């Protein structure tokens, strides 16, 4: 499988998605057709959310279509070579994806070879559940289960308390591995390999285990 899971969209002083471009270009391998899932977005229209993405990705050979601008979203996902999931509120992203019947189809399509790119809420969505989002529960998603494509739980925008909250999760779900992924960092899964990247310190939390700092290049 091919996933690019970014903690966030924009480095300080840089353009929205700029640090992700080389990563995406490296991973596309000729793929062009993309559907953008805008549902995490709240304060900006989904229509407008779709354009910034197309803007920076079009030169990379990616044709981005908003999943809210197509007549048959299920078929759009089935035919897509790339699934892009933007940031925003994770609960709304999951609620809409589930209600619209797009959750399993997105997972199926990525399992069948499509490249998945998600940042912030979109990185959360790739995990087994959204139990590690920092977002407020503004809408009930009718289940916390998510795409279940990446086996570990990612806590994006990580900064430490946050560790205390993660430790409470580890009391109720002792089998989990939680990755505190700081802004600026990402996890790129490609050719049978999940690799950590970025200049900031990443942390991993497991039940009964001291926090472990992971270095860029660490393979999960």
Helices (H) and strands (E) in the chain, counts: 7, 11
CB atoms within 10 A of CB 6: 28
Strands (E), the chain: 2-6, 33-37, 63-66, 82-85, 115-119, 153-155, 177-180, 186-189, 194-197, 202-206, 212-214
DSSP string covering 57-101: HGGGT-EEEETTSSS-HHHHHHH-SEEEE--S-HHHHHHHHHHTT
Contact predicate 146/127, CB 8 Å:
yes
On the CB side of 13, CA atoms within 13 Å amount to 0
d(CA 135, CA 72): 30
What class has domain 1-220?
alpha beta
According to DSSP, the residues that pair with 49 across neighbouring strands are none
- Token pair listed for 216: 């860029």
Chain-centroid distance of CA 127 in Å reads 8
d(CA 121, CA 111): 20
Cα separations in angstroms, 215 against 31, 157, 187: 30, 17, 12
What radius of gyration do the chain's Cα atoms show?
Answer: 16
Contact predicate 13/125, CB 8 Å:
no
Contact predicate 113/64, CB 8 Å:
no
Nearest-CA neighbor of 158 among 129, 190, 201?
201
- Give the determination technique: X-ray
* Enzyme catalytic residues: 120, 135, 157
Contact predicate 13/36, CB 8 Å:
no
**Residue 69: Cβ-neighbour burial (10 angstroms; 0-12, 13-18, 19+):** middle
- Please tell me what DSSP assigns to residue 216: T
d(CA 70, CA 185): 32
Domain boundaries in the chain?
Answer: 1-220
- Token pair listed for 190: 């490609």
Strand order in the sheet with 177-180: 153-155, 177-180, 202-206, 212-214
d(CA 132, CA 188): 19
CB atoms within 10 A of CB 201: 13
Query: Crossing angle, helix 90-99 and helix 103-111, to 10 degrees?
Result: 90
Phi, psi values for residue 63, rounded to 5°: -100, 110
Contact predicate 36/49, CB 8 Å:
yes
Question: For the chain, how far is it from start to end, CA to CA, in angstroms?
Answer: 14
d(CA 88, CA 135): 9
- Token pair listed for 38: 């805008």
d(CA 156, CA 107): 20
């Amino acid at each position: 499988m091919e996933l690019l899971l970014l903690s966030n969209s924009t480095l300080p002083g840089k353009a929205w998605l700029e640090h992700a471009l080389p990563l995406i270009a490296n991973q596309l391998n000729g793929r062009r057709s993309a559907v953008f899932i805008p549902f995490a977005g709240v304060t900006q229209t989904w229509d407008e959310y779709t354009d910034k993405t197309a803007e920076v990705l079009a030169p990379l050979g990616v044709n981005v279509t908003g999943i809210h601008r197509v007549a048959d979203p299920l078929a759009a996902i089935e035919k897509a070579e790339i699934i892009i999931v933007g940031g925003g509120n994770t609960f709304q992203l999951l609620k809409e994806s589930r209600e619209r019947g797009l959750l399993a189809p997105m997972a199926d399509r990525v399992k069948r070879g499509a490249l998945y790119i998600g940042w912030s809420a979109g990185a959360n969505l790739a995990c087994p559940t959204i139990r590690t989002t920092n977002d407020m529960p503004i809408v009930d998603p009718n289940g916390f289960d998510a795409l279940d494509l990446f086996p570990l739980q990612i806590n994006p925008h990580f900064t430490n308390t946050r560790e205390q909250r993660i430790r409470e999760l580890l009391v109720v779900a002792p089998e989990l591995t939680v990755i505190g992924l700081p802004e600026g960092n990402w996890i790129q899964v490609s050719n049978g390999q999940a690799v950590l990247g970025g200049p900031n310190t990443t942390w991993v939390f497991k039940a009964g285990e001291e926090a472990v700092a992971l270095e860029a290049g660490h393979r999960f």
